[PDB]
């Protein structure tokens, strides 16, 4: 299994992004999938996630601006980023526990990082 | 089933 | 993107050793680069990187004994190794997170690995 | 170096097939060596590689139904491909990581492909 | 500017 | 000396 994230870019503050996070391969269930930040020369940290709950649960700087959401047929999430701002800026990170079809054992999965960027 | 992020 | 390595060789232990990691292609901005190695049988594990912060981690392995510096012009990044054991032995891998100039999506580049033995 | 890739075509589900590949050129160590296949439309997949200490990996598809061995004096390896299914249909890629007698660089080497086709 | 590993 | 896949 493998995760390419797209969207993300540049803008200014008051500005949108949409990310794709699509994910190859076998999948029979999610543990965890979401996006972490991380600020340069800090600690990564969670963003948004959803457990399999079902119960997403958002980091505080997240108000509405962040709005999580999946495409299950086609193994793609998207976090639509809405009113951007400088002080939030990071490394974005695609993030996945899953199970594929022929194993009971979990993985970890990141993606390679998206720049955003204000 | 229901929609693999919860059968 | 291409990356290639240079340096490495055979030293008796105590000895010393430089390695390089040359970047060809356009670069926006740098979010990690630097070395792993893998000694035959084992699992690759990372010997010095620099992140985005610009803060530069060492194995616990290290203790000192190597020294991670760069040239961004050149798109160089070098590791000076001294006080090389027999245990150092093994295949270091440049290693690239990397901005490509225009795309927004990070993506990792490896060198095709450089040859180190230290013995007598 | 060179590699020339022989065997691969088309059978059944059930069948067999067998792939062998050929190095030209002088070759000190073997860092990796083994295939890759790419079905059309997808990725590329690593398949079944040796590493330095021996150990021979096999991807998860493998089920034990493909089995790798070598020669090191033809300087060949052989991929024996049993118990096929239409899902393995892909192009088949040799490959190395070798140092160049020469230096203490490891180059990449692919050879060109071979067709393994199952169907009906 | 310091040098892009970052101004 | 083993066999250049490694000696």
């Known amino acids: 299994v493998t995760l390419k994230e797209s969207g993300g870019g540049l803008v200014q503050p008051g500005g949108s992004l949409r990310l794709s996070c699509a994910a190859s391969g076998g999948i029979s269930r999610v543990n965890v999938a979401g996006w972490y930040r991380q600020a340069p020369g800090q600690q990564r940290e969670m963003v948004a996630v959803i457990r399999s709950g079902g119960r997403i649960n958002y980091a505080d700087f997240v108000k509405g601006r962040f709005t999580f959401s999946r495409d299950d047929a086609k193994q793609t999430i998207y976090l639509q980023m809405d009113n951007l701002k400088s002080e939030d800026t990071a490394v974005?990170?695609?993030?996945?526990?899953?199970?594929?079809?022929?194993?009971?054992?979990?993985?970890?999965?990141?993606?390679?990082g998206t720049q955003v960027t204000s | 089933x229901l929609x693999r992020x919860x059968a | 993107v291409t990356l290639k390595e240079s340096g490495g060789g055979l030293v008796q232990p105590g000895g010393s050793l430089r390695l390089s990691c040359a970047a060809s292609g356009g670069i926006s901005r740098v979010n990690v680069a630097g070395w792993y190695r893998q000694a035959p049988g084992q699992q690759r594990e990372m010997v010095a990187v620099i992140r985005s912060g610009g803060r530069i981690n060492y194995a616990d392995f290290v203790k000192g004994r190597f020294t991670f510096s760069r040239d961004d012009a050149k798109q160089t990044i070098y590791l000076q190794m001294d006080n090389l054991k027999s245990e150092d032995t093994a295949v270091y891998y440049c290693?690239?997170?990397?901005?490509?100039?225009?795309?927004?999506?990070?993506?990792?580049?490896w060198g095709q690995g450089t040859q180190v033995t230290v013995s007598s | 170096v060179t590699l020339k890739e022989s065997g691969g075509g088309l059978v059944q589900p059930g069948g067999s097939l067998r792939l062998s590949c050929a190095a030209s050129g002088g070759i000190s160590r073997v860092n990796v060596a083994g295939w890759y296949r790419q079905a059309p439309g997808q990725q590329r997949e690593m398949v079944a590689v040796i590493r330095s200490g021996g150990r021979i990996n096999y991807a998860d598809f493998v089920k034990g139904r493909f089995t790798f061995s070598r020669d090191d004096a033809k300087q060949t390896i052989y991929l024996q491909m049993d118990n096929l299914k239409s899902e393995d249909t892909a192009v088949?890629?040799?490959?190395?990581?070798?140092?160049?007698?020469?230096?203490?660089?490891?180059?990449?080497?692919?050879?060109?492909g071979t067709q393994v086709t199952v169907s009906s | 500017x310091l040098x892009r590993x970052x101004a | 000396x083993l066999x250049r896949x490694x000696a």
């Open positions: 290693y690239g997170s990397l901005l490509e100039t225009g795309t927004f999506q990070y993506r990792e580049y």
